[PDB]
C-alpha cells in the first residue's frame, strides 16, 4: 500500500547511508510498477514480476538511494564496483527487484578497509589511512572516505542522477499478500 511515499518520496538518502522500509499489514498491487513507463530499469531476480501478486510474505523491505546512472549496473548480485563494495552490496543468492528511474529533474564512499557484507551499511566519516594508521587531522597520507557526485542538469545521462529502490522479500502466517 504505502509505496506512494517510497517511490514518490520527496528526497532520498544517498548510497553510503541507504535504509529500508516495511510493507507489513498490507495487501500489495505491484502493477503501479508494471504500468510505469518512466522506470529506466526494472530487474527482478528469482521471482517473476507480473505474478508477484500471487505470493505471500511476512514483510517486504525497500532500500532507497541515488547513484550516478553509470553505476546502476552494479546494484545487482555478484558485481564488482566501488558502490557494490563500500556502499551497498547485494547477496549472491539475492531475490527481489531493482528499480531505477531518472532524477535529473548526494555522496558515496570510495575508501574503506575491506568490503561490505550483503545488506550491511557503513555510516562513519573517519579519515582513511591506506595501511591502518589512526590519521591525525589533515597531515600526510590522510583522506576522508566519503565523496560527492556533484550532479548537474547539463552533462552525460550516465553521469546524471538516478533514483534506485531495491525490494527484497521475507515462518508464520504471511502478513502481506496480493489481491
Amino acid at each position, epitope marked *: 500500500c504505502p509505496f506512494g511515499e517510497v517511490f514518490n518520496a520527496t528526497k532520498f538518502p544517498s548510497v553510503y547511508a541507504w535504509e529500508r522500509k516495511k510493507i507489513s499489514n498490507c495487501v500489495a498491487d505491484y*502493477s503501479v510498477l*508494471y*504500468n510505469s513507463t518512466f*522506470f*529506466s*530499469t*526494472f*530487474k*527482478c*531476480y*528469482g*521471482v*517473476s*514480476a*507480473t*505474478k508477484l501478486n*500471487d505470493l505471500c510474505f511476512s514483510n517486504v523491505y525497500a532500500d532507497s538511494f541515488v547513484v550516478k546512472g553509470d553505476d*546502476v*549496473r552494479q546494484i545487482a548480485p555478484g558485481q564488482t564496483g566501488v558502490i557494490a563494495d563500500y556502499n551497498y552490496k547485494l547477496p549472491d*543468492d539475492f*531475490m527481489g*527487484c531493482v528499480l531505477a528511474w531518472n532524477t535529473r529533474n548526494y555522496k558515496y564512499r570510495y575508501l574503506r578497509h575491506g568490503k561490505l557484507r550483503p545488506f550491511e551499511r557503513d555510516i562513519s566519516n573517519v579519515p582513511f589511512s591506506p595501511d591502518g594508521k589512526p590519521c591525525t587531522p589533515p597531515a600526510l597520507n590522510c583522506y576522508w572516505p566519503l565523496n560527492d557526485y556533484g550532479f548537474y542538469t547539463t552533462t552525460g545521462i550516465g553521469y546524471q542522477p538516478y533514483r534506485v529502490v531495491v525490494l527484497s*522479500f*521475507e515462518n508464520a502466517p504471511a502478513t502481506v499478500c496480493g489481491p
Partner: antibody
Amino acid sequence: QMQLVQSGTEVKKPGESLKISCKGSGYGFITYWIGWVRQMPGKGLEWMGIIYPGDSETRYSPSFQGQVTISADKSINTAYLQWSSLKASDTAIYYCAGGSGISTPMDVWGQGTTVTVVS
Amino acid sequence: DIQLTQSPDSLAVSLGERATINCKSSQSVLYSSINKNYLAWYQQKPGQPPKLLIYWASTRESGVPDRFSGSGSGTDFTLTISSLQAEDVAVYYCQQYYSTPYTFGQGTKVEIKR
C-alpha cells in the same frame, strides 16, 4: 499481459549475415528478459541465451558463446539474434521467450521464426 | 552445470488414465530461503510454440486445467496428467531456471491408446 511477435521466415545461402528480430508489445514490458531457443526439425529445445533490454545485459550458453550474438534495443522493445555468417547446421526454428525476471520461467512465447540456409 | 534428464522417451496412455513423466537433475534446484524449486514444465503440441504449464514444480500457470499436476523436490520431479484427454497429445519438457545457463529436458512424447 504482453505479446511477442518475431520476424518472418528467412531463406538464406551458406555464408551470409542474418539478424532476426523479436518485438514485444503490451503493458509491463520493461520487466521482461528475452531468451532465445533453437529447435531443429524433429529435435527438442535448446536454450541459447538471454538478454535484458533495459541495459542489454546478456548471458550466453556455453554452446553458443561467440557463435551468435544476442542484441537488444529498448527504443522499439526489440530483441535480436544474429549470425555474421550462416552454417548449414543453423537451419531450424528460433523462438524468443520472455521471463518477468531472471531465474524465472518463460511466461510469453513468440510464434517462431523459420530459418533455412541451403545451397 | 545443471543438466536435466527426463524419462521415458515416449509413453502411450489410454484416455482417462494417468500419464506421469519423471525429470531428474544433476544438482538440486531449491533456493532454501523461499523454499521453492526452480523447475518448470512446458507442453508443445505439433506446429505450435511451447506453453508454460507449471512453475516452481507445483504451481500452475493461469488458465491451465486442474488435471495437470506437478510434484517432487530436491533432485526428482514428476509431471502427472490426470483424466488424459485427446488434445493432450504433445511433447512435454522440464526446464530448470535455477542457474544460468538454463537447461531443458530432452522431452517426452505422450501418445494415446484408444
